[PDB]
């Protein structure tokens, strides 16, 4: 009158092992819990956009009190264009109705992998830029603009250097299926 | 004869895994290039798997991973 | 928990010399 439970069989896990040493460090594993917007391949490494953003203000000679600025229009010319443009050229930036141009060489030259991989550090305050220009125009990226797209709310995920990770939206996360066909 | 007690695990007998001596091969390379100790590559390797999940695994020849 | 980091190895650089004494004067 036990009623008999079916017994549990516990397939036990097979650890990979070289000359007879388990290889991963459980104790360590247990608390390894870095975030997914650090370990990807798209962005670069700290490293690498380090070296990118000093060897800039050395090639432009620019006090690091004053590059925000500049970096804060290269961030908004990369929005308006693709992140492969002609090596050698110009990028516009704006002073109340007039331009004023710097050389592109220095910027898509110390870029290690590349342009796209290295700028994506913006990738996730372009978000906010989008969606403040979009609350008072109709205000589009001429990529996804010219890449058959019509949506207009999607417009906060339609720029070349655009990340994904778990957090976007199921509308923006397929959107890019078809925009990069 | 022999066959009525040849029951290997499932796991051992494929065509993905790699065969021990393959794996043991790589393992200890990778030991002599990196030249870190054996008691601290459990760290190394505890890394690698959760990067490869993160991304694929074909990628760059160059390059770095991060940990 | 240190986390091994590759060490580096810094390959020295090789002075020309000539009888034992540097020739350029760095």
Redesign the interface.
Known sequence: HTVPRIKAITSKM?M?K??GA????LE??LE?A?Q?I????TRA?QSQFDTWYEAVQLAYDIGETEMPTVMNGLMVWCIENGTSPNINGVWVMMDGDEQVEYPLKPIVENAK?TLRQIMAHFSDVAEAYIEMRNKKEPYMPRYGLVRNLRDGSLARYAFDFYEVTSRTPVRAREAHIQMKA
Not at 22 to 25: D, R
């Open positions: 097979r990979p070289s000359k388990t290889v991963l460090n360590h594993l390894y870095p997914q650090d370990i990807s391949n490494t992998p």
